[PDB]
Design a protein around this ligand. Structure first.
Ligand SMILES: *[C@@H]1O[C@H](CO)[C@@H](O)[C@H](O)[C@H]1NC(C)=O
Length: 375
């Protein structure tokens, strides 16, 4: 509907979960915009790091500009204050050691700019991050950033070398990395090269992990025309696979459904079954700019002439938003485990997976896998 009312599903009535649903819904919008731009390539995305940079920035923004941002983050549908106080919490929860997610955001400003401490104060408190002011020296500024996303990602992300843009006003950076563990490991001796249908005309061989007697939560959505399965990870997390029925690169109907609320129903409507599971080994990375995506996400106003007078007196505008993500999984797990039910779940064709946090329900990672072999 779109109007302000009180929450019903007890899950979203919790403030931190409510905030996670908004930020996550922003993630889904971004994914949909980006998937539309990359019709033939894998899409790896960890929206949280980017959503956090926007929300942090919105601190030194004024009414009109702030709203533009708040509306893209679904905050205007949250009838609760201390939205930043809650964000501090959410972050504390999903970045905890037990999870295996490392997510960081950074606001970078143009050379010689002077930032009002009234802005730095709220920012460092709620988001635990200080703004970096560019040096002007191209080689020195790029070193700084790389060392930053290095100390942050504990050196699990490829040190970039794209050379910061000549023209920079405000730069937002969102980096994230993930290497987790299933509650049940896979037999490394059961992993073999198998056929992966890239599409109806092309096939390739990628190493596939296997478990002929896997216990996962399953469900078939007749409308979307796909098979949904959920595998748990240690640290109270899960991965949801959306496997279409026929081989295809067209996953639109499905993508169009991805929302926080939709995922909550699927999570509960799922039934535990036993299945023959084969999932490809995955090790992916992505380093790009999502500025063009945000531009057609009702966020153009920020690249034009926004009002950030709460940050500085000089007119500054959102110039670029960069994202660096690294995702990976394999056999590593925690431990192991009349009349049955048949069930095949073979991920040997284009699919979409969603790494979600079980406690808050926050979207930690999303990917459209057209080719396991990676970029
Ligand atoms: C994707 O498949 C659906 C269902 O067959 C179809 O309606 C849609 O047109 C396809 N995507 C296109 C045509 O861009």
């Amino acid at each position: 509907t779109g109007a302000l009312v009180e929450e019903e599903d007890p899950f979203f009535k919790v403030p931190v979960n409510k905030l996670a649903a908004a930020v996550s819904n922003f993630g889904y919008d971004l994914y949909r915009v980006r998937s539309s731009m990359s019709p033939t390539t894998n899409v790896l995305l960890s929206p949280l790091s980017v959503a956090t940079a926007l929300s942090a920035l919105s601190l030194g923004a004024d009414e009109r500009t702030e709203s533009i941002i708040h509306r893209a983050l679904y905050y205007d549908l949250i009838s609760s204050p201390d939205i930043h106080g809650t964000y501090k919490e959410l972050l504390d929860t999903v970045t905890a050691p037990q999870k295996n997610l490392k997510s960081a955001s950074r606001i970078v400003f143009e050379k010689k700019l002077r930032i009002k401490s009234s802005f730095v104060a709220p920012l460092e408190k709620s988001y635990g991050t200080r703004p970096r002011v560019l040096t002007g020296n191209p080689r020195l500024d790029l070193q700084e950033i790389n060392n930053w996303v290095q100390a942050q990602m504990k050196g699990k992300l490829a040190r970039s070398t794209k050379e910061i843009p000549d023209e920079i006003s405000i730069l937002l950076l969102g980096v994230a990395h993930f290497k987790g563990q299933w509650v049940t490991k896979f037999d490394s001796r059961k992993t073999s090269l198998e056929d992966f249908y890239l599409d109806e005309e092309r096939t390739v061989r990628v190493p596939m992990m296997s478990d002929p007697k896997a216990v996962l939560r399953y469900g078939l959505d007749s409308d979307l025309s796909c098979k949904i399965a959920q595998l748990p990870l240690t640290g109270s997390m899960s991965i949801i696979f959306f496997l279409p029925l026929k081989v295809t690169q067209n996953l639109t109907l499905i993508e169009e459904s991805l929302t926080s609320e939709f995922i909550h129903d699927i999570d509960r409507e799922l039934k535990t079954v036993q299945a023959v599971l084969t999932v490809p080994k995955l090790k992916l990375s992505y380093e790009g700019e999502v500025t063009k995506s945000l531009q057609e996400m009702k966020l153009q106003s920020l690249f034009d002439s926004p009002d950030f007078s709460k940050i500085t007196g000089k007119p500054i505008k959102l110039t670029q938003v960069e994202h660096r993500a690294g995702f990976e999984w394999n056999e590593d797990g925690a431990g192991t485990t009349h009349l049955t039910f048949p069930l095949d779940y073979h991920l040997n064709q284009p699919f979409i997976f969603v790494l979600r946090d079980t406690d808050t329900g926050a979207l930690l990672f999303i990917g459209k896998i057209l080719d396991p072999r990676g970029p």
